[PDB]
Design a protein around this ligand. Sequence first.
Ligand SMILES: CCCCCCCCCCCCCCCCCC(=O)OC[C@H](COP(=O)(O)OCCN)OC(=O)CCCCCCCCCCCCCCCCC
Ligand SMILES: CCCCCCCCCCCCCCCCCC(=O)OC[C@H](COP(=O)(O)OCCN)OC(=O)CCCCCCCCCCCCCCCCC
Ligand SMILES: NC(=O)C1=CN([C@@H]2O[C@H](COP(=O)(O)OP(=O)(O)OC[C@H]3O[C@@H](n4cnc5c(N)ncnc54)[C@H](OP(=O)(O)O)[C@@H]3O)[C@@H](O)[C@H]2O)C=CC1
Ligand code: SF4
Ligand code: SF4
Ligand code: SF4
Ligand SMILES: [Zn+2]
Lengths: 96, 52, 56, 156, 46, 116, 337, 52, 176, 207, 48
Amino acid sequence: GVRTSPTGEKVTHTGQVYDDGDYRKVRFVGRQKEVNENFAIDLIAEQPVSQVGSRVISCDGGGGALGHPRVYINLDKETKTGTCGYCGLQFRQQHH
Amino acid sequence: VYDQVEFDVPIGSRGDCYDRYLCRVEEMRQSIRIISQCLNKMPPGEIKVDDA
Amino acid sequence: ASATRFIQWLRNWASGRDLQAKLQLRYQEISKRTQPPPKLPVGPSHKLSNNYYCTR
Amino acid sequence: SRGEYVVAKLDDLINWARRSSLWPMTFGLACCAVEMMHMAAPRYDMDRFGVVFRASPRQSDVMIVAGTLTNKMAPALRKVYDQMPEPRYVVSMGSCANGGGYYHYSYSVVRGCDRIVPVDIYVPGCPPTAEALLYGILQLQKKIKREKRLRIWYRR
Amino acid sequence: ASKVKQDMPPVGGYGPIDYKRNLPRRGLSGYSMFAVGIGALLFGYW
Amino acid sequence: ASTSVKPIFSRDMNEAKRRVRELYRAWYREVPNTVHLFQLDISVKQGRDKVREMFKKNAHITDPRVVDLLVIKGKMELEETIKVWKQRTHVMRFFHETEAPRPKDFLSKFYVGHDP
Amino acid sequence: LHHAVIPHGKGGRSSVSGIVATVFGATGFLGRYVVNHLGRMGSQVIVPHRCEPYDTMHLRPMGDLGQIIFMDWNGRDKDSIRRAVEHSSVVINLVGREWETQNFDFEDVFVKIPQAIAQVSKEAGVEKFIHISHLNADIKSSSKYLRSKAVGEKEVRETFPEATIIKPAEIFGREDRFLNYFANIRWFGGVPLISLGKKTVKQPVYIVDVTKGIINAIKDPDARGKTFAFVGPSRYLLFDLVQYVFAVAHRPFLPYPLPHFAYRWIGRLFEISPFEPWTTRDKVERIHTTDKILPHLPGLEDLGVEATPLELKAIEVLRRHRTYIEDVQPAKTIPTS
Amino acid sequence: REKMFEFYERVSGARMHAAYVRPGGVHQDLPLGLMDDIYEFSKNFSLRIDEL
Amino acid sequence: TYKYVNLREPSMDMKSVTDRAAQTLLWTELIRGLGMTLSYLFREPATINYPFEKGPLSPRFRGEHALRRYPSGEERCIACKLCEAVCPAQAITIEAEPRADGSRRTTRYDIDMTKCIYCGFCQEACPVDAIVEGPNFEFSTETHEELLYNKEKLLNNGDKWEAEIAANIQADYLYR
Amino acid sequence: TRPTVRPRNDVAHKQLSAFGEYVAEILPKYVQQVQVSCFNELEICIHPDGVIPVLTFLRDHSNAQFKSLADLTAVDIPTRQNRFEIVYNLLSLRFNSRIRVKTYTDELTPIESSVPVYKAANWYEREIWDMFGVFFANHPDLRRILTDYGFEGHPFRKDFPLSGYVELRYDDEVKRVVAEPVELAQEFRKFDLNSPWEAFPAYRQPP
Amino acid sequence: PTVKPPTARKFIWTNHKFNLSGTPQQYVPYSTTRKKIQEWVPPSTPYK
Ligand SMILES: CCCCCCCCCCCCCCCCCC(=O)OC[C@H](COP(=O)(O)OCCN)OC(=O)CCCCCCCCCCCCCCCCC
Ligand SMILES: CCCCCCCCCCCCCCCCCC(=O)OC[C@H](COP(=O)(O)OCCN)OC(=O)CCCCCCCCCCCCCCCCC
Ligand SMILES: NC(=O)C1=CN([C@@H]2O[C@H](COP(=O)(O)OP(=O)(O)OC[C@H]3O[C@@H](n4cnc5c(N)ncnc54)[C@H](OP(=O)(O)O)[C@@H]3O)[C@@H](O)[C@H]2O)C=CC1
Ligand code: SF4
Ligand code: SF4
Ligand code: SF4
Ligand SMILES: [Zn+2]
């Protein structure tokens, strides 16, 4: 989420932050640094893993044509989940 | 599909500003006449060529 | 649409026309701003056979 | 009966008059001028806000730059600005005037009218809708309302 | 199956749309107008 | 042959040179009016030296057709000035008053950037 | 050098000069030229201003996007000074006023404010400090303006020892209060002169020359800790200068003598105005102060600037004062040292 | 004109620079209810021309 | 087929000549023009009471840009750069890299709203409905710099306007 | 026929071909090549000396009567010795037909002004001179028409940079608009879009 | 929306904001990427 640097400036979800000697932080004096506080990396991690009963599952992101291109995810490895390359949802084969 | 709609071309006689003004005003009436045919004769189907 | 009959008569006479039958302001004759969803047709190339691209 | 109070109320009066009687000089350069004309047209009727439609540059208080500013045209735009009596404000209307827009990379186009004149309001769009321009004009009115010319004078 | 639904003219088309010029005739003849005007002068003179 | 070409105005350099001198005289006499008409802050001497500098930079040409086009362009430039189609900004663009002097020696270029 | 202040580009509007300058007093005569020269080469310019934002609009076109930053400040608030300097590498003090107001006198503008800026800049770690003083600064001067200049100059040198102090002569230019001052004396029939404009020698300097000298001082490691005198090339008698000014403005020149006592009441009489006075006692005392010759100090040539002759630029300034052959008649110059 | 700008906006999402006609056809099909509104506009337009 | 707009020869009998003389002297056709402007005086004006009333728009309206998310809150944009390639004005600037969790995501997504022509090509090109032009058109600013949107600004616009953006997409996606 | 394929018009193709031969038979002194496109457009390629004679014949001949000059422009092709292609597009109302006449020139070879034939050509030739630097002999008033006064170069040449060499801003020190070398806060981004696979075999060129 | 409320999302703003231009809350642009070239840091000790 939004942490702060020693100078007090917020760190963006891309890791950007002016360091101590960077004059460019003068642009924020009397104004503000726009930062989006909903870090997508943290939000996708909150989602639970779907347990499915097949070796291959498909994801379109939900909402049909309002989602992403439909992709098929292999679930043979049991040492990791299958992750959707588009939306980051995770799937795991139950039993096998 | 302009060869499937009916309209008249207004023609001037003196080639001055007034006749050109009359032609433009009459062309507006013909456009309404054409729009009337487009509304009635609008066909169904796809709206862009089916060649991806 | 809300003009009194006297004002309606006055402006009809002044303009020489029956303005009330063709008001330039829109009331309830316009289409709803919410519509049922469409279902658009597909073109002639949506076929499962006899549809080789080299023929079209 | 402090001087701060009187200066404060006199500021409000002159600010009220100036924002309530804004006379624009529209520099209709290209497409954006059409939307500017739709802001004067009946639906939005800019005149009802006290913003007279067609005012001469001699009496204008605000210049609206509505369209692409080319290099060949830049000197003439600066000349009109220099001849505007004060207080004078500039509204930059549309992508071309804001920063070059579609023609930003052209050899013949000034990349934003703010290279030529100081700009008070930037209205985005290509073109901005007539309502968007009106929103921007009303934004300029509130900017004038915030002015503190006499308060600053009193504290000099 | 859901039928195709797209914007189309209503069954039977739309009603007639006027487009020809219509500038109606009004007023009196030239004789009548000049008669009224001359009659006004005479009554005023009298 | 491929060296047998269509002329513009001059059939050889001597004919071309006459046109150059006629253009130079026209520019030389125009400068006092230009300084007055555009109310420039340069002297007539500065304007005439600028005219001479512009003619000198093209002194190495030996192709009459190239010289013809230089004179054609120079005359268009003169007409723009005489007719007052130019504004004062256009006239003053020959003098680059707002451009700082770029360094010319090797060391000075070395200190500022990468360009030769 | 931090990686953001390494110069890049070719010195134009979109380049990076590596200069981050806080310019106090940027909204005045000298400030507008300084900001323009910083903006041309792609510097980051911080402009603290006391005035209305509307009064700073002419500065906005001088820099590429984001290169001119505006802040509010108050000369008596050291926190507003700190916010404006703490990111800068150079601070330029152009704050000054030719008259005293109820809220600020010559001690405030020329002593207290410059010392506050210098002290805060030193604490903030600012590397370079450029302070504009006056050629004729002197604690024995009859002009209170010039006496405060002398005191303020001494305090800045104590507070910020590595400061660059520039001591210019009267500056002429389009927005000057020098040539325009003399031109506007014509707006009244009388043209008074202490003595007859004699016993006063002036060495005025062109505004752009001062600006280039300031800019070159920012870039010159040698200039740190020094005091410069910026003067024009030619010394003139105040009577000849004013006579030349009227000649260029195509005005009828009517001299008439006056002593200081009768020249102080006219100064007082216009000091009553609640705005910029047309003239004041102090302005007259400064105008009739002979320009010091200070050969122990470096000048424009030490910074690689050629002083611009007044005759080459008088028309530029005074053309607007004309009523509607260019004999001009160059003014007589005192023989060079 | 303001009402015809609405037809532009309802098919393209822009009042003027629609970018709607493209090589191959048009970008999108007409929204449901648009032709009825064009009919209502066209029905009264010739009266507007007469007033002009 | 063609028609003549002005090829009528006036009749030259007393009745007609005197009708035209009456028009000339009694200004009748000028009076008729006065009647038309008087009729308009008594018509209701077409003016709406902005900003309390607003001009009608449609779900297709192309306004201020915004970056969208999936219902989970994950960003939709997977840094394909189709939007940046198609942008007719070159108004989009994108940089990308693997995110900490390995996801393909942008580290820069800038739109110069003063280069943008508001054509909507970017939202047509986007394969995942990440970039859209929302319904907001009231975002004029006092400085040029405020119209140079970076990714933070655009994600904030998405979070700000998603309620309306989603409903507008729901209303038009079957036409797309 | 195929709903997505443009239909061919073989009658017009034959008519235009026959008229193209007709023109080439009558003006052999100038006509270098005649071709008809697959979408039925006739192009007459001529030696530049034939501008006035060919255009005059096409305007005035009873079986031609190309009274209208629809458009006149140039194309810059740097790989050719004569880099500039001059294109005249003519319209015949009598025969409801169009024709294109093309010739060529280099940077130093004048072309004869067609203003005597079509007074429409006056401004079109000024535009070609302004944008391409092609000189037209005996033009009544040849000068720039689209570029700024004093502008240097011809910006529609393929080797003139898109953003030019100079740009304008107002300078407060000199109180006027000034010109300075172009610097861009964001450089224009060149995209390489061409596929490395051939798209149209019918247009393949010998190795 | 009293009849057809919007779909709820955890990330949608619960507090709408008006146009913040000209205030201390105004947007200020900045580059969102990290430094690309790392410079060599000299050792903090003398050679010898
Ligand atoms: C018994 C016998 C007694 C003897 C006396 C008998 C006399 C009666 C018979 C004579 C009638 C006289 C009429 C008086 C009006 C003057 C007529 C006139 O001059 O108008 C013609 C003028 C030129 O018309 P035009 O067609 O352009 O060219 C003709 C020349 N080649 O064109 C014009 O002037 C048109 C007007 C131009 C201005 C247009 C803008 C104003 C129009 C709106 C005005 C509304 C009415 C104003 C009434 C106000 C009353 C207070
Ligand atoms: C701010 C607005 C104030 C108003 C508030 C509301 C009240 C409205 C009262 C205004 C009355 C005028 C408005 C109506 C005018 C429209 C009527 C009309 O269009 O009539 C047209 C008529 C026919 O013209 P046309 O088609 O050319 O026919 C030619 C051959 N027949 O043409 C005619 O027949 C014209 C006949 C009249 C000709 C008279 C010539 C002028 C004589 C001047 C006398 C003026 C007397 C009135 C002055 C006021 C004193 C009471
Ligand atoms: N011009 C000359 O002939 C000479 C000038 N100098 C010195 O150069 C410097 C500037 O000259 P110039 O530019 O002509 O002076 P100006 O009067 O033209 O501008 C003065 C600047 O100081 C600011 N200022 C004045 N008083 C205050 C204050 N009390 N609090 C905050 N800011 C204030 C003004 O801001 P605002 O606009 O808000 O009032 C303005 O920006 C001064 O120090 C002057 O003494 C030296 C020698 C000669
Ligand atoms: S911003 Fe768009 S609508 Fe406005 S002038 Fe430029 S291209 Fe035309
Ligand atoms: S709307 Fe058009 S111009 Fe604007 S960012 Fe999208 S593709 Fe580019
Ligand atoms: S916004 Fe859409 S088109 Fe653009 S880079 Fe992201 S996923 Fe690709
Ligand atoms: Zn998915």
